[PDB]
Write a protein that binds this DNA or RNA. Structure first.
Ligand SMILES: [K+]
Ligand SMILES: [K+]
Ligand SMILES: [Mg+2]
Ligand SMILES: [Mg+2]
Ligand SMILES: [Mg+2]
Ligand SMILES: [Mg+2]
Ligand SMILES: [Mg+2]
Ligand SMILES: [Mg+2]
Ligand SMILES: [Mg+2]
Ligand SMILES: [Mg+2]
Ligand SMILES: [Mg+2]
Ligand SMILES: [Mg+2]
Ligand SMILES: [Mg+2]
Ligand SMILES: [Mg+2]
Ligand SMILES: [Mg+2]
Ligand SMILES: [Mg+2]
Ligand SMILES: [Mg+2]
Ligand SMILES: [Mg+2]
Ligand SMILES: [Mg+2]
Ligand SMILES: [Mg+2]
Ligand SMILES: [Mg+2]
Ligand SMILES: [Mg+2]
Ligand SMILES: [Mg+2]
Ligand SMILES: [Mg+2]
Ligand SMILES: [Mg+2]
Ligand SMILES: [Mg+2]
Ligand SMILES: [Mg+2]
Ligand SMILES: [Mg+2]
Ligand SMILES: [Mg+2]
Ligand SMILES: [Mg+2]
Ligand SMILES: [Mg+2]
Ligand SMILES: [Mg+2]
Ligand SMILES: [Mg+2]
Ligand SMILES: [Mg+2]
Ligand SMILES: [Mg+2]
Ligand SMILES: [Mg+2]
Ligand SMILES: [Mg+2]
Ligand SMILES: [Mg+2]
Ligand SMILES: [Mg+2]
Ligand SMILES: [Mg+2]
Ligand SMILES: [Mg+2]
Ligand SMILES: [Mg+2]
Ligand SMILES: [Mg+2]
Ligand SMILES: [Mg+2]
Ligand SMILES: [Mg+2]
Ligand SMILES: [Mg+2]
Ligand SMILES: [Mg+2]
Ligand SMILES: [Mg+2]
Ligand SMILES: [Mg+2]
Ligand SMILES: [Mg+2]
Ligand SMILES: [Mg+2]
Ligand SMILES: [Mg+2]
Ligand SMILES: [Mg+2]
Ligand SMILES: [Mg+2]
Ligand SMILES: [Mg+2]
Ligand SMILES: [Mg+2]
Ligand SMILES: [Mg+2]
Ligand SMILES: [Mg+2]
Ligand SMILES: [Mg+2]
Ligand SMILES: [Mg+2]
Ligand SMILES: [Mg+2]
Ligand SMILES: [Mg+2]
Ligand SMILES: [Mg+2]
Ligand SMILES: [Mg+2]
Ligand SMILES: [Mg+2]
Ligand SMILES: [Mg+2]
Ligand SMILES: [Mg+2]
Ligand SMILES: [Mg+2]
Ligand SMILES: [Mg+2]
Ligand SMILES: [Mg+2]
Ligand SMILES: [Mg+2]
Lengths: 97, 51, 51, 94
RNA sequence: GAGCUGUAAGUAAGCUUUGAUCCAGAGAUUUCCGAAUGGGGAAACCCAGCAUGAGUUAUGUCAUGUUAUCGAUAUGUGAAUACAUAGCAUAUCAGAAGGCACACCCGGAGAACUGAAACAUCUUAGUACCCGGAGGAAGAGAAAGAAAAUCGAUUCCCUUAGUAGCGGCGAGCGAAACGGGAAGAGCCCAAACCAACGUUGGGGUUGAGGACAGGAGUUACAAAGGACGACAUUAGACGAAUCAUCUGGAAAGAUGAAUCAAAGAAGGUAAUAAUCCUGUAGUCGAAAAUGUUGUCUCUCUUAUCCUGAGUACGACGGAGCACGUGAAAUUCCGUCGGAAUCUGGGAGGACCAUCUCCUAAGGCUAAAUACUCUCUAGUGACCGAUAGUGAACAGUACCGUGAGGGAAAGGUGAAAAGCACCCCGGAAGGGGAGUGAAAUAGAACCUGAAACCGUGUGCUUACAAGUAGUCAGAGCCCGUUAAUGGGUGAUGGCGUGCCUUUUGUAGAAUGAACCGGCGAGUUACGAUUUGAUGCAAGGUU
RNA sequence: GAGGGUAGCGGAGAAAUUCCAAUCGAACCUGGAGAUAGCUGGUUCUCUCCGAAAUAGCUUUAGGGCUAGCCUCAAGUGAUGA
RNA sequence: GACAAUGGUAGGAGAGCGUUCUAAGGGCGUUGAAGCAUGAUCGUAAGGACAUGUGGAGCGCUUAGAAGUGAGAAUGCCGGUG
RNA sequence: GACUCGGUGAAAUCAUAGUACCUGUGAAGAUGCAGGUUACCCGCGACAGGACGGAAAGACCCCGUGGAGCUUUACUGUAGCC
């Protein structure tokens, strides 16, 4: 309350809407995939069991932060472009599930 | 180690003496006591449960 | 009869009732002809026959 | 457990150590009147009456028939009857 | 298992081991009013009828039963009016009435102060009050569901989440599904269709089914009973172990030496007791009644047609849904209209098509859940007599026409041993003498503060102008927690209380007669921040 | 005089805002209820350190409020202060 | 040891006193507890002891925990007494 | 009635009071401050100039986004009626 001066959240406009079907992904960066041994097959079950992902949400997405120094096979719902490039560059493979 | 009925009955009426199981260990009871008298099996169970 | 609201153009609320369209006719209740208050919708339905 | 006519020892109070017969029993108040015990001097209007005043039943104790030592009294059954028996010896109390 | 005739002293008269008082189970009695019901009535009263019985020559009087209204059954009788019906009389039943803790529950009806810094939409709030109906719970409940990979009645807890949304898009209001749990149970009809004389039986009960072609039970699913046993409840019984000395009025305290413990909970006893008492741990116990219960028993069973019609649904007006008519689906009410019939119908948030899920317009159903006037057993870093109930001795006294409002008031002592007797006094009240450990514990009774009221007097005071003290200071009187002491104070300097509120108060602004007691930032749930601590790409339920 | 009737969103009034149980521009009692009170009053032990403001802007605002200004506490930063 | 600082309302910060209750430890008390009264006592304050009288059965201390935790004012409430 | 004596015996009020005047000062009208002036201690009967004397949280006046009663071609409703 501003004593009768029009309050701040009335002098400002409303903006936007909320998407009912908003999809939010659990995100794993490259630096978090470095805890697995070479040749590992990474899967949402393995990421959940290892403590990398607590809540899976709409699916797992791999992002490109950090350095990946281990060859892996990754099965995730989504990959960022740099994530795919750095997974394949290090000799590994990735699949979309 | 477990609920020993005869030990509990024999020690119940002695003032200053308290009886508990390994599972029932709590900080008030241990802190109040001046000494702990624990069986071998109870000691092993305590070591197992509390790591 | 059910209660509800009469609403003004400014949406001022005033309690009001909805009365049944009762009509006094003779319907032969329990074998004996008898003039009773009966709703016109009930007369349309056909459960109660006059005279 | 203390009855009229009993021989009792006074184990607490001014007359501790004295023995006497239980003259009266006041079970509602848990007091007994013991002859020669707790003598009061009352001012009679129409002299000075000197008579026993009751004392609490827990201040008297029965004497064992055999050792003549104070004893708590238990209870036993003999042919469908409850009989007082001394703890110290076990002999039945009169 | 020896006292007893309530509280509750006092006698008097009695009862009681030939078993009382007392406790529990069951019986008997149970005036009058009150729904109050034979009629009336200003409740606890008045006045009757009928039948039966006492009494009286007889009347008066009395005793007992019966007589309300509305319902229910069944025998007559009788209108307007011919049959009939309405109605009327009689017998039989004893169904309703009224009350409450009516706290929780369901329904009808339904505010306002208030918030929005005004106010009308909105909010308070479907709250308060009123009314109706019940139960030990109620309500809900067996998908025309949730959903979108499938689940499988209802309810309730956690969470989702103060999210989605609603909203003079203000103040505010505010879900649900998924997931985790408590509990867990499913069933009966209507219809087609058969048997019989439209009404009864058979049959059937759904997401495609139906028509046609031993195991289950009185907690729903049909409903009444017995036999025996069990347990528990409503009285009770047993139940270990201490002596001495000291101080004391009294020992349980101190001291010394012992004991018991499945019992060192607690209360009492002349001060503070495991061993003195009542008890405690533990064990035992029911003539009778009441339950809950198990077994036996006892019961019952072995796509041709149909599928809820004045219905669904629609318009208008409203309401309930978190949702204010809005893109408003979904549910209900009034008025008016008004379908389809498995190629059917409904929902998936306007609506259409596909797809998916379901199968309305009949009913029943335990448990998980809500509450406490109560009862039984217990508990408390809850009160301790201005507190804690209004009430420790009261819905009383008192106030009011009434509805209604509503106090104050606890403590002798261990034991009444409650002051024989003498003296003054009419008495009241005292002084002695006694009781008692104590009487300045004597009933107006534990302790007994302060205000306030008195008696005695060490210093001081009748030439003095004042918020009463303070600093300096002789004189006089005392002598301590022994301190460069205490009381008083001639005389001198300085000096307009306190609180509140104010620019500013000695203020002639506010408040307080004095003394005492009581009397005001608390708690819950959220948010944020700081300190502390644990763990750490994890932390935590 | 007696016995009755009219009741508060109401009665009654040869009318005065007049009476309705000793104050009637809307009786009394209880409940909502601790209504609301931007107003007045009150708010209880001690010491230690620091120490304001009575201004601006906006305000159905003017003895109220909000942000800024001025106080304090704690971490930073370090020439930026006088 | 040697330099500085220490008036203060609203208000911010810090440290303490005392009350009742609880836990643990250790104590006191009929050879007299709490309460009350008096005193020339101690501490920087809130406040703490001791001695004597009264009183007649409970009460301190230490550490920690919790609050119905502190009154002089409210035309405050109740009582008592001017 | 008042007044004196015997009996009985309230009240409003009240921060504590050993409570002078003048001129001044001061929240601008002083028992209480300054400077002077005046005044032995304690009653009783009287009078009302002051204690801005007592009584009632000013009825006037203003203020509160207070209330209530009343009015109307204020706004929005509504009983009723057509
Ligand atoms: K005793
Ligand atoms: K004034
Ligand atoms: Mg009656
Ligand atoms: Mg009658
Ligand atoms: Mg009657
Ligand atoms: Mg009947
Ligand atoms: Mg009946
Ligand atoms: Mg009832
Ligand atoms: Mg009821
Ligand atoms: Mg408002
Ligand atoms: Mg009701
Ligand atoms: Mg009811
Ligand atoms: Mg026994
Ligand atoms: Mg014993
Ligand atoms: Mg002894
Ligand atoms: Mg159907
Ligand atoms: Mg609605
Ligand atoms: Mg709806
Ligand atoms: Mg809608
Ligand atoms: Mg529909
Ligand atoms: Mg008291
Ligand atoms: Mg009381
Ligand atoms: Mg005397
Ligand atoms: Mg005398
Ligand atoms: Mg005497
Ligand atoms: Mg005497
Ligand atoms: Mg005394
Ligand atoms: Mg006294
Ligand atoms: Mg002179
Ligand atoms: Mg002189
Ligand atoms: Mg003077
Ligand atoms: Mg002076
Ligand atoms: Mg000021
Ligand atoms: Mg002024
Ligand atoms: Mg003053
Ligand atoms: Mg004055
Ligand atoms: Mg004022
Ligand atoms: Mg005053
Ligand atoms: Mg006071
Ligand atoms: Mg607050
Ligand atoms: Mg009335
Ligand atoms: Mg008149
Ligand atoms: Mg008038
Ligand atoms: Mg006029
Ligand atoms: Mg009047
Ligand atoms: Mg309210
Ligand atoms: Mg109020
Ligand atoms: Mg300073
Ligand atoms: Mg100004
Ligand atoms: Mg404006
Ligand atoms: Mg200072
Ligand atoms: Mg200074
Ligand atoms: Mg502070
Ligand atoms: Mg502190
Ligand atoms: Mg303290
Ligand atoms: Mg105490
Ligand atoms: Mg307090
Ligand atoms: Mg006061
Ligand atoms: Mg007085
Ligand atoms: Mg005269
Ligand atoms: Mg006189
Ligand atoms: Mg001044
Ligand atoms: Mg001047
Ligand atoms: Mg003057
Ligand atoms: Mg002067
Ligand atoms: Mg005079
Ligand atoms: Mg005068
Ligand atoms: Mg005046
Ligand atoms: Mg005023
Ligand atoms: Mg006024
Ligand atoms: Mg004036």
């Amino acid at each position: 309350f501003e004593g009768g001066q029009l309050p701040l959240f009335r002098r400002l406009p409303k903006r936007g809407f909320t998407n009912i079907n908003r999809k939010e992904y659990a995100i794993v960066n490259l630096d978090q995939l470095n805890k697995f041994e070479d040749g590992t097959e990474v899967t949402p079950a393995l990421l959940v069991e290892s403590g990398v992902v607590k809540n899976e949400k709409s699916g797992i997405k791999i992002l490109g932060n950090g350095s990946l120094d281990k060859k892996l096979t990754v099965k995730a719902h989504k990959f960022s472009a740099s994530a795919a490039e750095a997974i394949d560059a290090k000799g590994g493979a990735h699949e979309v599930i | 180690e477990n609920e020993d009925v005869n030990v509990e009955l024999s020690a119940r009426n002695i003032p200053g003496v308290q009886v508990t199981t390994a599972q029932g260990l709590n900080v008030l009871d241990i802190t109040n006591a001046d000494s702990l008298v624990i069986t071998e099996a109870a000691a092993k169970k305590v070591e197992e449960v509390l790591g | 009869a059910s209660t509800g609201n009469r609403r003004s153009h400014a949406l001022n609320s005033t309690k009001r009732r909805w009365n049944a369209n009762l009509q006094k006719v003779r319907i032969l209740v329990d074998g004996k002809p008898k003039k009773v208050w009966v709703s016109a919708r009930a007369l349309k339905s056909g459960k109660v026959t006059r005279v | 457990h203390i009855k009229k006519g009993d021989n009792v020892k006074v184990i607490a109070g001014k007359d501790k150590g004295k023995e006497g017969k239980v003259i009266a029993t006041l079970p509602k108040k848990d007091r007994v009147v013991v002859e020669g015990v707790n003598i009061m001097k009352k001012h009679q209007k129409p002299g000075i009456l000197e008579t026993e005043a009751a004392i609490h039943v827990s201040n008297v104790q029965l004497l064992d028939p055999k050792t003549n030592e104070p004893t708590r009294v238990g209870y036993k059954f003999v042919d469908g009857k409850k009989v007082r028996i001394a703890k110290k010896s076990g002999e039945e109390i009169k």
